[PDB]
Amino acid sequence: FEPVTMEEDEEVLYKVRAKLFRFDADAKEWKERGTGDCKFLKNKKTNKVRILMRRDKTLKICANHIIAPEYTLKPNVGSDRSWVYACTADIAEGEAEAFTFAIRFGSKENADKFKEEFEKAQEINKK
Amino acid sequence: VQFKLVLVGDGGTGKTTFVKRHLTGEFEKKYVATLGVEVHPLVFHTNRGPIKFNVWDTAGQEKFGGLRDGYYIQAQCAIIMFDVTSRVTYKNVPNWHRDLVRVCENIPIVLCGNKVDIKDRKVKAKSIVFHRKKNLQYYDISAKSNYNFEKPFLWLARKLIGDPNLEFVAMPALAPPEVVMDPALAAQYEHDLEVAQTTALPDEDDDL
Amino acid sequence: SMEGILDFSNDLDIALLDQVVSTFYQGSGVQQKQAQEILTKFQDNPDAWQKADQILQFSTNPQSKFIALSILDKLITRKWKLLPNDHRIGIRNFVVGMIISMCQDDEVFKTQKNLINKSDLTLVQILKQEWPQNWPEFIPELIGSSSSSVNVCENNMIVLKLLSEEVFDFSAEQMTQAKALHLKNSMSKEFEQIFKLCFQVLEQGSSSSLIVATLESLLRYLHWIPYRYIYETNILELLSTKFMTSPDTRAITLKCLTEVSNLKIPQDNDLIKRQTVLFFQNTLQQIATSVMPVTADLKATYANANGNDQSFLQDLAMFLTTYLARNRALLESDESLRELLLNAHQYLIQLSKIEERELFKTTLDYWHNLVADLFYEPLKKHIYEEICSQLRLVIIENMVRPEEKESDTIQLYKSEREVLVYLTHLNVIDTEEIMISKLARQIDGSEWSWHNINTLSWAIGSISGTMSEDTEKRFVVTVIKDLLGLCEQKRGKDNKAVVASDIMYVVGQYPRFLKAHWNFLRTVILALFEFMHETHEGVQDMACDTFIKIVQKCKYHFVIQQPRESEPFIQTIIRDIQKTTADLQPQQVHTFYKACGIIISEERSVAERNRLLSDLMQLPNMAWDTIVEQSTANPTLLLDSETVKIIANIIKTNVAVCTSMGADFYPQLGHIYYNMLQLYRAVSSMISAQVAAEGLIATKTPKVRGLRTIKKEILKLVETYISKARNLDDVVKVLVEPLLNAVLEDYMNNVPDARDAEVLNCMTTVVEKVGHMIPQGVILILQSVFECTLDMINKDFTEYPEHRVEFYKLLKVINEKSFAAFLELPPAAFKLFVDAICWAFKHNNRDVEVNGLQIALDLVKNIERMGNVPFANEFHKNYFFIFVSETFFVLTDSDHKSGFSKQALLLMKLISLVYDNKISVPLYQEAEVPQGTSNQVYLSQYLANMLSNAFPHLTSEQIASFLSALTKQCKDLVVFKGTLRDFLVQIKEVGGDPTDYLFAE
Amino acid sequence: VPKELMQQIENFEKIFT
Ligand SMILES: Nc1nc2c(ncn2[C@@H]2O[C@H](COP(=O)(O)OP(=O)(O)NP(=O)(O)O)[C@@H](O)[C@H]2O)c(=O)[nH]1
Ligand SMILES: [Mg+2]
């Protein structure tokens, strides 16, 4: 009787909920870019780690860049649960563009843990 | 695959803020009244391919109305917006609907009650019934808390495409490029970084 | 280059216009944005209407003609009567001719529907100006031209639809009362002729587009025409049979029959009753034979969303619910109508299974109407036994989450609970059986799921209080017994967490059961205490919400000594409170302490209640004592974020307990009060010292935000107690004086960005409760907050929004409870007080605007109560016309329509003072008016000049007639308001009829 | 109160143990 994404080659090292901001320098103002899951993805064919962050519901990319060993996470004056750092090539919105990002988390613990994983991944990419 | 979407409603109801959230993810706190209309392409990725909305964000204030119903010509879908903290904006929904369906006689229309994040709600759920006899979809939404902020476009996509099982799907994430510092821009990025650090992040009390 | 059309010295280049238009509608980006700004400027040229006859004749672009008609529309609705009479006749003639020639060209009539509809609406605007007084033959000629062409006949149905809409459906806001009545009477007079045409087209016509357009006009007619046009003709038969078979006419016909179900009908004539039965009988018949049988799966059909199925099913629900809510009694007695009655409800059952939130609410509203009637009306419920049995299942299976944040889910749950409570009373046995059966299929896995177990548990919890205590007891036992076995049956903390929560929700809903079974109630609480150690997401938050929910209902059983117990259970809770709450978050610990305060307040022995209070607060009081010792020793400790957080959590614990205990909290408040205010001062100094050393950005830092939290919780604690205190002597003689010394000067002498708006809120409560007892204290409040807060908020409407709101709440309560404080203000400060009230008028913010209007109204009454004294006489001389003119300004500026009612009330009160001679001195200066002129004459003179300069396009006669009616009606708020609305219409146009203001007469 | 309920609910606290 006869019967009737593009991140699959990667590996999730870290996942955390966070809100992402970009600095509008010409307006001296932080502007939100997306709220959702922030992930560190290790490529199996290069061992290179990237940040991939998607907005909830729409799942549109709001962050997509390598965790470069050169980047440096800095505190924000008004937050004990955020990090600020400059990004020289993010491809969430088309061509590679430079941004001054800020990422905030639900607790100071997620913020410190993020910086921990963020640094582990930096050494991974240094090779 | 692009559909014209007209967005109408009283001034201050959040139409432009709603679109901005979908375009950039930002939340604009300032009320800068739209002058006439503002057109913005908006693309969503679905299991039926990408769908494009040419959003015509119109002005709600009469003194900034511009071409008024002239903006509705050849629209294929629409959103009517009101503010659940302002009864007058709901009292005027039948007026916006009248002017709309006189130009667009058979299009899918969503009625949106914005700003449900505000505790002191004035247009209670039980009072919102205008959509029943007019066959409008209704959604409580908040452009600030993102409550149901995707439902109006998901519903419209399903009507315009004719597929009740259409879903938003995750756009593909290309491999990001490798970085190389430019020593001729080091002091340039550490300048903008200092300004960014000493500028407080907004809404530091939000759960996220 | 596109900006050439904006030069009127030259002839308009139609080809250039059509290019700008196409660039706007079909272009993109910058070119579209530029063209848009050009078209807006072209359309708003006050002379652009003169070039409309050219565009409509020589343009080949429909969008350009549409814009041309928009330009004409503005002209007709706002400046028609200002034209020479030759342009009025001309514009009329070439709008009529344009429509005629568009209908005769079948190709244009088919492909330019948008431009033809726009032309019909434009014609309708002319009719509102010119018909019937200056166009008596319009309707006769319309009826004549209809027979010469199907296209023109179809289009005349569109013209009549739009006319009926503009006259009856949308005239209330857009016309004066007199003008609306004139047109309503004009259409009523000539409708006999209109209906004849409409009925002949429906009976004879075959063009479907003509039929549909005629039925769409009929839909509008049914809003206002008398019922005799519907019941004394054959039109009901046509609608309910002929037009229900064609899918083209079906949608509109159903909407028409829905409105027919709302007609004003005599409820005593038997033939009419039969006619109302008959068209329902025909409609249900056509649905069963032409659309789908009553067995059809409408849930599946709606989900498929083919064609217009979703709209049709929505319209059917509206028709069935509307008719049945009004007329189902007509079907309940005659046995030959029973099948029809039940088939109609069976359709509603099938409609109620559709997955569509808003449609479910429409049918749920009807079910409420039905089951409520069966609950009270004798001999009715047996008819619907089978319907009700199916409904019990529909509601149990579609039960939504109770609050146990979505405000659309909370309203729907309460609606569902109401209907299911009624359905349970109507047959308790059937409801119990369905729920137990549904629970069996949760245990055999055939319907097991997280959604299905939650839905069933919510349904079980919702009918609490409907069964007998004996049945409830048997029922609760079976459910809990079965749910507990279902918990063991599962593995994984995720599964066991879902079932655990449901079990606790159910028990939390049946307090009558818990109160009668102490040993059970006790064991329940102990389980919660152990659930407060489970770190799994959601368990702890559940355990705590259930605990306080049970306490609010069963508190008495925790404060007494139960049989076989050596102590009231509250003591056992307090002894192990550190252990119980050891793994909880601060928010959850405070809920716990709040729940204990609820119990403690049930103890009416003062001595035992205060002991329990002291024991409950033992932990936070010892931490408090420890900090007050070392915090003063080294004030830098308060920069340690750990100490700051500890302090804030101690205060929040006092707030939580004070929320439950209110007046009974006083003993605990006195334990910490004096040292708490010292802490308030020390914290204040650090915030100030931090801003001095770091700048304003310090206020954003976590250190300062934590220090301000301390201050805010201290104010919230004092606010919470005072608002509930029963001993106001102690409030005044103990609390107020240290409080004001601690907060007022600190608020006044901080920079704007460091002032806490909570200070204002706290002072509002102080004034509210003991304002009458501290006149000097109130004066001190004004001196410290009034001017420095006003200067924060009188530069725009956006900055310092919280200070803005609390500021006017404070002035409002001061104006109510201690008006003397304003009498002490120096004249310059009282002038700022008046300025601040009017400033509130001009806010779009509703929180501010409403209070500003109330303060103004209350101030006028306070002044009036003073009688004929110098301060009241000076107030009127200085500020009467300021309030009159400022009130008029927001009434007429079109940006404050949300406050119309209260503006009208304030204006009526102001006008009535002068016309009741309640102002003793002349409101004019010795110079500007003859000796002895009444304030009435001067008021009408002032207002006549004010409105003439503010609205110079009004005639002196309009202003005079408006004011004459307004002042005559200043004792009748509804008529007063109607006259103001009439004025708001007239100022939007030129040539308003001054006799419109005699409508009330 | 039915005495078998107790036996089952007293084990309720140890559901997470
Ligand atoms: N609390 C809250 N505020 C909102 C929300 N959406 C918009 N707003 C705010 O409401 C104000 C008006 O925003 P806006 O988008 O310009 O409304 P609009 O309908 O485009 N006005 P116009 O028709 O005159 O252009 C803004 O301050 C905005 O931050 C919301 O969802 N919640
Ligand atoms: Mg806008």
XYZ file of N, CA, C and O in Angstrom, chain C residues 713-833:
484
model
N 11.053 55.545 49.684
C 10.347 54.561 50.498
C 9.985 55.122 51.867
O 8.932 54.777 52.417
N 10.831 55.987 52.432
C 10.491 56.646 53.691
C 9.239 57.497 53.516
O 8.329 57.478 54.354
N 9.180 58.266 52.427
C 7.995 59.077 52.162
C 6.775 58.202 51.904
O 5.664 58.541 52.325
N 6.960 57.075 51.211
C 5.839 56.183 50.940
C 5.325 55.545 52.223
O 4.118 55.315 52.370
N 6.225 55.249 53.161
C 5.808 54.687 54.440
C 4.982 55.691 55.233
O 3.908 55.357 55.749
N 5.473 56.928 55.348
C 4.734 57.963 56.068
C 3.412 58.245 55.371
O 2.365 58.375 56.017
N 3.439 58.348 54.041
C 2.209 58.548 53.288
C 1.227 57.412 53.538
O 0.028 57.647 53.734
N 1.717 56.170 53.544
C 0.831 55.026 53.727
C 0.168 55.055 55.097
O -1.030 54.775 55.217
N 0.923 55.381 56.148
C 0.322 55.377 57.478
C -0.685 56.509 57.629
O -1.815 56.291 58.081
N -0.284 57.734 57.280
C -1.137 58.891 57.532
C -2.463 58.751 56.793
O -3.521 59.124 57.313
N -2.432 58.201 55.579
C -3.655 58.044 54.802
C -4.626 57.053 55.429
O -5.796 57.027 55.033
N -4.175 56.244 56.388
C -5.020 55.260 57.049
C -5.164 55.506 58.543
O -5.905 54.772 59.208
N -4.491 56.517 59.087
C -4.515 56.747 60.523
C -5.930 57.046 61.005
O -6.711 57.715 60.324
N -6.254 56.540 62.195
C -7.499 56.877 62.870
C -7.300 57.854 64.019
O -8.272 58.483 64.451
N -6.074 57.999 64.512
C -5.750 58.923 65.596
C -5.006 60.103 64.977
O -3.783 60.079 64.831
N -5.758 61.144 64.620
C -5.179 62.287 63.932
C -4.518 63.277 64.881
O -3.691 64.079 64.435
N -4.857 63.244 66.171
C -4.133 64.058 67.142
C -2.659 63.675 67.171
O -1.778 64.541 67.168
N -2.372 62.369 67.195
C -0.986 61.915 67.192
C -0.298 62.251 65.876
O 0.884 62.611 65.863
N -1.018 62.138 64.757
C -0.451 62.518 63.464
C 0.058 63.952 63.522
O 1.203 64.245 63.158
N -0.791 64.867 63.988
C -0.434 66.280 64.007
C 0.640 66.547 65.053
O 1.659 67.189 64.775
N 0.433 66.048 66.272
C 1.264 66.444 67.400
C 2.584 65.686 67.470
O 3.494 66.129 68.178
N 2.721 64.572 66.749
C 3.924 63.748 66.788
C 4.610 63.690 65.428
O 5.830 63.859 65.327
N 3.841 63.457 64.365
C 4.423 63.108 63.073
C 4.719 64.320 62.194
O 5.808 64.419 61.622
N 3.765 65.245 62.068
C 3.842 66.259 61.018
C 5.063 67.152 61.213
O 5.816 67.414 60.266
N 5.272 67.644 62.433
C 6.327 68.632 62.649
C 7.706 68.087 62.303
O 8.427 68.743 61.532
N 8.135 66.925 62.801
C 9.426 66.387 62.338
C 9.453 66.104 60.847
O 10.502 66.271 60.211
N 8.330 65.677 60.268
C 8.294 65.374 58.841
C 8.580 66.618 58.009
O 9.447 66.601 57.126
N 7.853 67.707 58.272
C 8.021 68.915 57.469
C 9.426 69.481 57.612
O 10.017 69.945 56.631
N 9.980 69.450 58.827
C 11.342 69.931 59.026
C 12.346 69.099 58.241
O 13.404 69.605 57.852
N 12.030 67.831 57.986
C 12.967 66.928 57.336
C 12.923 67.004 55.815
O 13.942 66.733 55.169
N 11.785 67.369 55.224
C 11.595 67.225 53.790
C 11.468 68.561 53.061
O 11.891 68.657 51.903
N 10.889 69.588 53.686
C 10.530 70.793 52.940
C 11.766 71.587 52.533
O 11.977 71.866 51.348
N 12.596 71.968 53.506
C 13.793 72.736 53.183
C 14.701 71.960 52.237
O 15.296 72.538 51.321
N 14.809 70.645 52.435
C 15.630 69.827 51.548
C 15.116 69.889 50.114
O 15.905 69.986 49.166
N 13.796 69.833 49.936
C 13.215 69.942 48.601
C 13.486 71.317 48.002
O 13.891 71.434 46.840
N 13.287 72.370 48.795
C 13.390 73.731 48.276
C 14.815 74.065 47.845
O 15.019 74.752 46.838
N 15.812 73.588 48.588
C 17.188 74.026 48.399
C 18.017 73.064 47.557
O 19.226 73.275 47.408
N 17.405 72.021 47.006
C 18.059 71.178 46.018
C 17.853 71.754 44.620
O 16.898 72.489 44.359
N 18.768 71.413 43.718
C 18.630 71.820 42.322
C 17.428 71.083 41.741
O 17.042 70.028 42.266
N 16.802 71.596 40.680
C 15.595 70.937 40.147
C 15.734 69.438 39.912
O 14.796 68.689 40.207
N 16.870 68.973 39.392
C 17.013 67.567 39.032
C 17.200 66.646 40.232
O 17.218 65.424 40.049
N 17.340 67.189 41.441
C 17.486 66.379 42.645
C 16.245 66.394 43.524
O 16.223 65.710 44.552
N 15.214 67.149 43.151
C 13.987 67.204 43.932
C 13.125 65.979 43.649
O 12.906 65.614 42.489
N 12.633 65.347 44.712
C 11.782 64.169 44.596
C 10.324 64.605 44.493
O 9.803 65.260 45.401
N 9.667 64.237 43.392
C 8.240 64.506 43.263
C 7.430 63.799 44.342
O 6.299 64.212 44.624
N 7.988 62.753 44.956
C 7.286 62.048 46.024
C 7.039 62.953 47.224
O 6.074 62.743 47.967
N 7.899 63.952 47.443
C 7.645 64.925 48.503
C 6.281 65.570 48.299
O 5.474 65.670 49.230
N 6.000 66.012 47.070
C 4.708 66.625 46.783
C 3.571 65.651 47.063
O 2.576 66.004 47.709
N 3.701 64.413 46.584
C 2.669 63.412 46.829
C 2.464 63.191 48.322
O 1.324 63.111 48.795
N 3.554 63.096 49.085
C 3.426 62.914 50.527
C 2.683 64.084 51.157
O 1.766 63.892 51.965
N 3.060 65.313 50.792
C 2.381 66.485 51.333
C 0.903 66.498 50.965
O 0.074 66.959 51.757
N 0.550 66.005 49.775
C -0.859 65.948 49.396
C -1.658 65.131 50.401
O -2.760 65.527 50.802
N -1.120 63.985 50.822
C -1.812 63.152 51.800
C -1.883 63.840 53.157
O -2.925 63.806 53.823
N -0.787 64.465 53.588
C -0.802 65.195 54.855
C -1.922 66.230 54.855
O -2.719 66.309 55.796
N -1.998 67.040 53.795
C -3.047 68.054 53.714
C -4.420 67.399 53.671
O -5.367 67.862 54.318
N -4.553 66.315 52.906
C -5.845 65.654 52.767
C -6.409 65.247 54.124
O -7.585 65.486 54.416
N -5.579 64.636 54.970
C -6.076 64.003 56.187
C -6.120 64.951 57.377
O -7.065 64.891 58.171
N -5.127 65.824 57.528
C -5.059 66.702 58.692
C -4.880 68.151 58.258
O -4.462 68.996 59.056
N -5.200 68.452 56.998
C -5.020 69.810 56.510
C -5.757 70.837 57.349
O -5.236 71.919 57.625
N -6.978 70.507 57.770
C -7.783 71.423 58.571
C -7.181 71.709 59.942
O -7.620 72.657 60.600
N -6.186 70.939 60.381
C -5.634 71.070 61.723
C -4.250 71.705 61.760
O -3.714 71.911 62.853
N -3.651 72.014 60.613
C -2.305 72.587 60.591
C -2.249 73.754 59.612
O -1.472 73.715 58.648
N -3.031 74.815 59.824
C -2.980 75.947 58.883
C -1.587 76.528 58.717
O -1.219 76.922 57.603
N -0.797 76.598 59.792
C 0.576 77.079 59.666
C 1.429 76.091 58.881
O 2.293 76.496 58.095
N 1.203 74.791 59.084
C 1.942 73.795 58.328
C 1.673 73.881 56.838
O 2.593 73.764 56.023
N 0.410 74.087 56.460
C 0.072 74.220 55.045
C 0.783 75.427 54.446
O 1.386 75.344 53.368
N 0.715 76.571 55.130
C 1.449 77.753 54.682
C 2.911 77.404 54.456
O 3.516 77.800 53.452
N 3.499 76.644 55.382
C 4.903 76.275 55.257
C 5.135 75.399 54.032
O 6.178 75.498 53.375
N 4.170 74.538 53.702
C 4.296 73.697 52.514
C 4.324 74.560 51.257
O 5.198 74.403 50.397
N 3.369 75.486 51.133
C 3.335 76.359 49.962
C 4.640 77.129 49.812
O 5.216 77.193 48.718
N 5.123 77.729 50.903
C 6.344 78.525 50.832
C 7.520 77.706 50.316
O 8.389 78.242 49.619
N 7.561 76.413 50.635
C 8.728 75.596 50.334
C 8.676 74.945 48.956
O 9.734 74.678 48.375
N 7.487 74.687 48.413
C 7.370 73.950 47.159
C 6.709 74.750 46.041
O 6.928 74.424 44.863
N 5.911 75.776 46.342
C 5.063 76.375 45.314
C 5.889 77.016 44.204
O 5.829 76.593 43.044
N 6.657 78.055 44.536
C 7.327 78.824 43.491
C 8.429 78.018 42.816
O 8.597 78.097 41.593
N 9.193 77.234 43.584
C 10.310 76.514 42.983
C 9.830 75.361 42.109
O 10.522 74.980 41.159
N 8.655 74.798 42.398
C 8.102 73.774 41.519
C 7.473 74.392 40.276
O 7.639 73.869 39.167
N 6.749 75.502 40.437
C 6.157 76.170 39.282
C 7.220 76.537 38.253
O 7.029 76.325 37.050
N 8.351 77.084 38.706
C 9.414 77.465 37.782
C 10.022 76.257 37.079
O 10.638 76.415 36.020
N 9.864 75.057 37.642
C 10.330 73.857 36.957
C 9.441 73.499 35.772
O 9.926 72.931 34.788
N 8.148 73.823 35.840
C 7.158 73.266 34.925
C 6.484 74.314 34.053
O 5.598 73.961 33.269
N 6.861 75.589 34.156
C 6.185 76.639 33.403
C 6.990 77.109 32.192
O 6.742 78.206 31.681
N 7.939 76.300 31.721
C 8.687 76.603 30.508
C 8.290 75.728 29.329
O 8.580 76.089 28.184
N 7.640 74.598 29.583
C 7.115 73.731 28.540
C 6.112 72.793 29.199
O 5.819 72.913 30.392
N 5.584 71.856 28.415
C 4.603 70.898 28.906
C 5.178 69.502 29.110
O 4.428 68.587 29.469
N 6.481 69.312 28.908
C 7.088 67.985 28.911
C 8.016 67.731 30.089
O 8.023 66.624 30.631
N 8.800 68.722 30.503
C 9.817 68.496 31.521
C 9.184 68.213 32.880
O 8.133 68.755 33.231
N 9.847 67.351 33.647
C 9.426 67.004 34.999
C 7.949 66.599 35.032
O 7.149 67.210 35.745
N 7.564 65.566 34.275
C 6.140 65.190 34.229
C 5.572 64.778 35.576
O 4.407 65.078 35.866
N 6.353 64.089 36.408
C 5.841 63.656 37.705
C 5.609 64.847 38.630
O 4.569 64.937 39.291
N 6.575 65.768 38.697
C 6.382 66.983 39.486
C 5.163 67.753 39.002
O 4.407 68.311 39.806
N 4.962 67.792 37.687
C 3.804 68.464 37.110
C 2.503 67.919 37.693
O 1.661 68.678 38.185
N 2.326 66.599 37.648
C 1.077 65.990 38.099
C 0.879 66.209 39.594
O -0.174 66.686 40.032
N 1.879 65.843 40.403
C 1.736 65.960 41.851
C 1.565 67.410 42.283
O 0.912 67.684 43.296
N 2.146 68.347 41.531
C 2.036 69.762 41.867
C 0.578 70.204 41.907
O 0.134 70.841 42.870
N -0.192 69.858 40.875
C -1.579 70.298 40.807
C -2.505 69.462 41.677
O -3.573 69.950 42.067
N -2.123 68.228 42.007
C -2.856 67.488 43.028
C -2.709 68.155 44.390
O -3.653 68.166 45.189
N -1.535 68.732 44.663
C -1.307 69.392 45.943
C -2.071 70.710 46.027
O -2.777 70.967 47.009
N -1.936 71.565 45.010
C -2.713 72.802 44.988
C -4.204 72.511 45.089
O -4.949 73.255 45.737
N -4.657 71.428 44.458
C -6.074 71.082 44.486
C -6.542 70.788 45.907
O -7.571 71.307 46.354
N -5.793 69.961 46.640
C -6.218 69.610 47.992
C -6.036 70.789 48.938
O -6.823 70.966 49.875
N -5.010 71.617 48.722
C -4.864 72.826 49.528
C -6.041 73.762 49.287
O -6.574 74.370 50.225
N -6.464 73.893 48.028
C -7.591 74.761 47.712
C -8.889 74.231 48.308
O -9.801 75.013 48.600
N -8.993 72.914 48.496
C -10.184 72.326 49.100
C -10.174 72.480 50.616
O -11.141 72.975 51.206
N -9.083 72.066 51.260
C -9.064 71.852 52.701
C -8.505 73.023 53.496
O -8.809 73.138 54.688
N -7.687 73.876 52.889
C -7.063 74.978 53.612
C -6.901 76.171 52.673
O -5.804 76.662 52.416
N -8.026 76.661 52.148
C -7.997 77.814 51.257
C -7.383 79.041 51.918
O -6.872 79.919 51.215
N -7.413 79.119 53.250
C -6.818 80.260 53.937
C -5.355 80.441 53.559
O -4.854 81.571 53.546
N -4.658 79.347 53.241
C -3.239 79.444 52.915
C -3.007 80.349 51.712
O -2.001 81.066 51.652
N -3.924 80.330 50.739
C -3.792 81.212 49.583
C -4.118 82.657 49.940
O -3.552 83.582 49.347
N -5.024 82.872 50.896
C -5.316 84.227 51.347
C -4.112 84.885 52.007
O -4.036 86.117 52.041
N -3.174 84.095 52.534
C -1.970 84.651 53.138
C -0.887 84.953 52.112
O 0.052 85.694 52.423
N -0.986 84.393 50.912
C 0.035 84.627 49.904
C 0.141 86.122 49.607
O -0.882 86.811 49.525
N 1.349 86.659 49.443
C 1.467 88.035 48.975
C 0.820 88.185 47.616
O 0.771 87.225 46.823
N 0.308 89.377 47.293
C -0.371 89.554 45.996
C 0.404 88.997 44.811
O -0.206 88.449 43.884
N 1.732 89.124 44.812
C 2.518 88.599 43.700
C 2.478 87.077 43.652
O 2.500 86.494 42.562
N 2.424 86.419 44.812
C 2.358 84.963 44.838
C 0.966 84.462 44.473
O 0.831 83.431 43.803
N -0.081 85.171 44.905
C -1.431 84.808 44.489
C -1.604 84.980 42.987
O -2.391 84.258 42.364
N -0.877 85.926 42.390
C -0.932 86.108 40.945
C -0.278 84.935 40.225
O -0.750 84.507 39.165
N 0.807 84.396 40.788
C 1.393 83.175 40.242
C 0.444 81.994 40.407
O 0.375 81.120 39.536
N -0.287 81.949 41.523
C -1.269 80.889 41.727
C -2.308 80.896 40.613
O -2.648 79.846 40.057
